[PDB]
Every structure is written in structure tokens, then in C-alpha cells.
């Protein structure tokens, strides 16, 4: 349920994060279209996060995937592509997406 990753706060690693996410999401049944959408969203969160170290927490529940990023052009993208987004203020991003 609890997945954790820590990357240096540098751009290079968003791909790595996307990669792990693609993995977690692939095990769900999240269709390829969905997993691509998820990469967009999580990469947006991580990109704003770097812009040090970056902490990413995947919570894999029954029907819900929860991504948590911690230490403006994009935020629209997150909200539209995802089902629920929150913020806290240091910055922390919250993300959740339902099943189709």
C-alpha cells in the first residue's frame, strides 16, 4: 500500500519517477491511456516540486491511487487530468485518481 521514493531535487529524475509510477499503475489494471495520463499529472507535480531532495509517496488502495510529492502553469493540467488535487504550504502536492 505504501510506496516511497526519494530523488535529488533535479529534473533528470522525473523520468525515473514516471517510470516507477508506470510500474505501480500497470499492476492495477489502469489502462495504457490512463497510465499515460497519470504520468502527465505526477510529472507535473514533481516538476513544480523541484522548481535539495524530492519525496514521492504512492499509496495503492483498492480503487484509488494516491500520489504525494514533497521536499503555476501546470496546475490546471493536474486538476483536469486527475480526480482530486490538494496543496499545502516548503510545498506539498496531493493527487488521487479513481478507477474507470
Amino acid at each position: 500500500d505504501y510506496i516511497e521514493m526519494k530523488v535529488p531535487a533535479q529534473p533528470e529524475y522525473v523520468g525515473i519517477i514516471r517510470l516507477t509510477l508506470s510500474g505501480v499503475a500497470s499492476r492495477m489494471g489502469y489502462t495504457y491511456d490512463e497510465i499515460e495520463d497519470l504520468k502527465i499529472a505526477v510529472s507535473e507535480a514533481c516538476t513544480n516540486a523541484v522548481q535539495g531532495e524530492v519525496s514521492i509517496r504512492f499509496g495503492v488502495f483498492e480503487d484509488r491511487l494516491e500520489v504525494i510529492v514533497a521536499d503555476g502553469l501546470g496546475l490546471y493540467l493536474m486538476e483536469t487530468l486527475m480526480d482530486e488535487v490538494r496543496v499545502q504550504n516548503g510545498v506539498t502536492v496531493a493527487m488521487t485518481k479513481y478507477l474507470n
Binding site: 529534473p11 522525473v14 523520468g15 502527465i40 510529472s43 502553469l73 501546470g74 490546471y76
Partner: protein, 95 residues
């Protein structure tokens, strides 16, 4: 990480981009495409991923193209990618 192939013929530039446009690579793309902006055709058939940073360098170079009178076309865009341009409402503005 990213591959940008420029061919300049007839004061007309054809760029083929293949790879990922994320936060890591978008500065490289901006720095490559800015000497061309300041008539462009860009092929994204082999772009595998893009987020707000790619659109950001694109909007900057589109602004540069309108300011210097040139052209800007985006072509062979994946249906999923072109749909992304719709959700950001840019299909009407930049092809």
C-alpha cells in the same frame, strides 16, 4: 534523453523531435529552437511524452515566430497528443 534534428533548406526549417519533452529536456529544446525563431515546421510523430514545460517552450517560440513574421506548424501529432492540445485549447492557436 531527447533528439532534435534540424534541416534548413529554402529559408525553411524542418525540425524532427523524437523522445521526451519534460522538465529535463525542455531547456535544451528552447535553446535549440530559439536561434531559429529569433518558417518552421516541427514533426512530433516520435515524441513519446510531453507536459506543461514543452508547451511552455512552444508558446515562447510561437510568440517569437509571430514577433519575427515567420511561420509555425506542428504536424504528425499523435491523436492522443492532439487531444492534449485540445484540452489545453491550443489546437485553435498553433495547429
Amino acid at each position: 534523453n531527447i533528439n532534435v534534428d534540424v534541416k534548413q533548406n529554402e529559408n525553411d526549417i524542418q525540425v524532427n523531435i523524437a523522445g521526451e519533452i519534460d522538465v529535463y529536456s525542455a531547456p535544451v529544446l528552447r535553446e535549440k529552437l530559439v536561434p531559429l525563431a529569433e518558417d518552421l515546421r516541427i514533426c512530433l510523430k516520435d515524441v513519446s511524452y510531453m507536459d506543461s514545460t514543452g508547451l511552455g517552450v512552444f508558446v515562447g517560440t510561437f510568440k517569437m515566430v509571430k514577433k519575427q513574421g515567420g511561420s509555425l506548424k506542428l504536424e504528425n501529432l499523435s491523436e492522443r497528443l492532439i487531444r492534449l492540445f485540445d484540452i489545453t485549447g491550443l489546437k485553435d492557436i498553433i495547429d
